[PDB]
Design a binder for these strands. Structure first.
Ligand SMILES: C[C@H](CCC(=O)NCCC[N+](C)(C)C[C@H](O)CS(=O)(=O)O)[C@H]1CC[C@H]2[C@@H]3[C@H](O)C[C@@H]4C[C@H](O)CC[C@]4(C)[C@H]3C[C@H](O)[C@]12C
Ligand code: 118
Length: 268
DNA sequence: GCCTTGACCCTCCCCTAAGGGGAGGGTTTAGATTGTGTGCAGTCTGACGCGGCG
DNA sequence: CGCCGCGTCAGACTCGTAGGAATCTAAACCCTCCCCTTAGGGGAGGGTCAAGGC
């Protein structure tokens, strides 16, 4: 049986048989020496059936080679099974994210706020945890901290890139009684003089949105991130962070400012 | 200023999985078939070499 | 060997623009080889950017 007849018996392409002969998965029963013509046999079909049976389970080709040439490989079927359930979990996550994306696109004609899930590494910060009378007043006590720390900690170099964020320890929304905590990432440890203390913040997987524009429409992004959290079955594991990437310090226009809100979450 | 130094940065080339697509090359093919197929040309005049007759 | 008619070969003005020539024609197989596909990774080779050190 030539390769054209075998490809019609097997209902597979000829190039598939060429590839399987090249890699050594399915070798023809007899190859004509002068022409090169591959000839196949029923005993090759009995093996192509096994190849197809394994390949329909999503096994990679090299896994199929290992399974059919070397027996007692029950660890490879377990690896493929665990990977299949992991991919199923990831696929359910992706499905929820794309359903949410369509309900939002069908909600507002322009999408102002995309949501991205990113992992934040561990870091060394100096932090001051304090009760703030108003969000407008929160901005006032930060530049005092910025000069005082550089005067009190000489040669202290902030990391690059600059991770300067806020920990919202409030489990509910309020305007005037915010128990907030100002953090700023630094390269190495230091002295803990004053109300400013040093600490490490654990690496977290967090869903983040970057808000461009003034600080009054941030409630939109928070409700959106909360909406994302309720829609996609995540649970808030830690306090939300507020990372100030660009602001009045690089650019004078207040509507081009940008900050990224991070929601530490786990899928539950 | 001349000279190193460590960190960055660029393009370019090759690699990934499982074949698809195509180019460019071989091979045979068993009713019987058995000799091509066009023109075209109104030149003249020298001049040379040769079959054939004497 | 000597001469006569026959076969053959070689020559024949310079400017612009138009300006070529146009028919006829396997198919089904197989092979190898080369490039292609994600979304980038890895490395070689070669440049470049601020630090300073004398
Ligand atoms: C969902 C979240 C708890 C979890 C609640 C509890 C504390 C709330 C923030 C603070 O109020 C400060 C600030 C007020 C602005 O007005 C809107 C933005 C800010 C960041 C709020 C957003 C959001 O509503 C927070 C994080
Ligand atoms: C210590 C030192 C600098 C800043 Sb800022 C800032 C950030 C958020 C809100 C208000 C101010 C900063 C600069 C670069 C990158 C990230 C943050 C800052 C710097 C100069 C002038 C005004 C503000 C804060 C603390």
């Amino acid at each position: 049986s030539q390769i054209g007849l075998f490809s019609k018996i097997c209902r597979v392409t000829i190039k598939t048989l060429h590839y399987y002969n090249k890699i050594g998965l399915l070798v023809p029963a007899y190859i004509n020496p002068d022409n090169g013509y591959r000839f196949y046999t029923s005993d090759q079909l009995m093996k192509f059936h096994q190849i197809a049976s394994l390949r329909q389970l999503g096994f990679t080709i090299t896994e199929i080679v290992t399974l059919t040439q070397d027996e007692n490989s029950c660890h490879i079927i377990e690896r493929r099974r665990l990977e299949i359930q992991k991919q199923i979990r990831d696929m359910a996550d992706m499905l929820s994210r794309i359903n949410h994306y369509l309900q939002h696109k069908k909600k507002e004609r322009i999408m102002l706020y995309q949501a991205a899930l990113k992992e934040i590494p561990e870091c060394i910060v100096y932090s001051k945890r304090f009760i703030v009378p108003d969000f407008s007043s929160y901005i006032k006590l930060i530049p005092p901290i910025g000069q005082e720390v550089m005067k009190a900690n000489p040669g202290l170099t902030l990391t690059t890139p600059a991770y300067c964020f806020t920990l919202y320890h409030d489990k509910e929304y309020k305007e005037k009684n915010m128990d907030v905590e100002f953090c700023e990432a630094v390269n190495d440890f230091g002295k803990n003089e004053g109300n400013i203390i040093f600490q490490v913040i654990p690496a977290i997987t967090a869903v983040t949105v970057i808000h461009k524009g003034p600080y009054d429409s941030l409630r939109n992004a928070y409700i959106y991130l909360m909406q994302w959290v309720e829609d996609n079955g995540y649970l808030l594991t830690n306090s939300p962070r507020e990372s100030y990437i660009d602001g009045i310090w690089n650019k004078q226009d207040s509507a081009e400012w940008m900050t990224e809100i991070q929601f530490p979450v786990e899928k539950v």
